[PDB]
């Protein structure tokens, strides 16, 4: 297969404006949301039809209970951080955990936390330790590293359980996740040449410009890979034309193992 990933995010907000959830948790496979929970619904719900179709109600019910507990835990941790920081007002706490199964068969796993959108604690599952970014994090690092069993548990989950979940979801969603929609690519002038691709899946694509067979990445404007809304993606790249000397410009696109070259006459 291509490379795939599973990740779960949590967001906690300490003093949210009216209506907005104190806690949200969303899972993803690759770019696809698969699960959602928040402090208003208090229910874990599918966000992909192939998840709803393959996981029985006992799954959603069980994780709904775990998520209600994780919500409270996140509130306690954020309250503690905001004390240590001696911060007033509304602040955010975030978690991300997940794993990748790479094309070549190797795996990665990661777990990290953020306070106000900046790295706070980063787990190293090989050295079994937490990297702290400041002294509030250092105090938390000490507490977490005193619990050696919990570090081992997180290493096992990242390396074994997470990969098993990902493989299970990849099969559930294989019609979506493992399909290929090749890009439609065109060049136009707007003075710079724009190389535009659309209609492609998966979103991973490489577009660049070459000039007389050489790649000058410092003078290329790369556009973002953006969702088109129908499940496919679009992207672009531009390079500025030299009006005093002719050059052979060509756009190069790589997608899912196929290379394309559009030479501009």
């Amino acid at each position: 297969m291509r490379t795939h990933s599973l990740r779960y995010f949590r967001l906690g907000v300490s003093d949210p404006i009216h209506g907005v959830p104190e806690f949200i948790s969303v899972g993803y496979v690759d770019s696809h949301p698969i699960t959602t929970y928040d402090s208003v619904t208090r229910q874990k719900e599918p966000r992909a039809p192939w998840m709803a179709e393959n996981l029985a109600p006992d799954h959603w019910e069980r994780y709904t209970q775990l998520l209600r507990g994780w919500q409270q835990m996140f509130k306690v941790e954020l309250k503690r951080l905001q004390r240590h920081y001696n911060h007033s007002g509304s602040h955010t706490y975030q978690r991300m955990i997940g794993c990748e199964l790479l094309e070549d068969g190797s795996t990665t796993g990661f777990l990290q936390y953020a306070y106000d959108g900046q790295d706070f604690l980063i787990f190293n599952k090989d050295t079994l330790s937490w990297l702290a970014v400041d002294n509030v994090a250092h105090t938390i690092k000490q507490a977490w590293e005193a619990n050696q069993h919990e570090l081992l548990y997180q290493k096992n989950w990242l390396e074994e359980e997470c990969i098993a979940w990902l493989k299970r979801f990849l099969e559930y969603g294989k019609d979506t996740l493992q399909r290929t929609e090749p890009p439609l690519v065109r060049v136009n002038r707007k003075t710079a040449l724009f190389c535009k691709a659309h209609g492609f899946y998966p979103p991973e694509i490489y577009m660049t410009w070459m000039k007389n067979g050489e790649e000058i990445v410092q003078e290329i404007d790369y556009g973002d890979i953006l969702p088109s809304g129908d499940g496919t993606y679009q992207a672009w790249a531009s390079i500025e034309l030299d009006p005093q000397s002719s050059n052979l410009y060509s756009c190069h696109v790589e997608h899912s193992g196929v290379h394309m070259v559009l030479q501009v006459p």
Partner: antibody
Amino acid sequence: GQNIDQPTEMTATEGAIVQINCTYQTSGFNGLFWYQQHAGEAPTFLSYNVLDGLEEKGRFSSFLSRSKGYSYLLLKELQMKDSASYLCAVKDSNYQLIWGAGTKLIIKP
Amino acid sequence: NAGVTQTPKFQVLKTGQSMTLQCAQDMNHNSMYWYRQDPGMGLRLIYYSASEGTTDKGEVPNGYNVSRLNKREFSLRLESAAPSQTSVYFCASSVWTGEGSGELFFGEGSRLTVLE
């Protein structure tokens, strides 16, 4: 389904060594616990394993092999106070604890 | 520093009688559990409470209900006792949810015999 197995009873001599086995077949694995339960009393936590290998705590050690789905609790220099039931339990992929039926350890003075 | 306090230690009931078992922990734990222990089998979860404010069924909920009254207390109700409910009942608690390496802390147990 999921299941966990350990012998019903073991008998050993005071001063000796006993190895209490626990094998499990589960849907996922999030760690293996051993508890001690003296007759008529509450179970109390003894050990937790989740990666492979042997961990020591006094006269008790606990081993885990994830690929073989097996653990043992090892008691050295047995004393009469070690007479008790020993319960294995495994957390599955959804953090449900699956409990073995327990091994009653009888010690001969 | 009491740990998990459950009552009563012993109780005889007639079929159809009602009974509540009490359990409190003073460890500031978030999760609480009611188990039954019977000869020849592993502990079986009746109901649990992952956090204050929520409860859910375990493996053997039929004939029981629970109340997570507050963070400390988790009571077990037998509205109409049946002989099959003759058992030893254990309340337990853990720091956080069932999820992770945290162990269980058990109460001293409640022995119920239900008789026709």
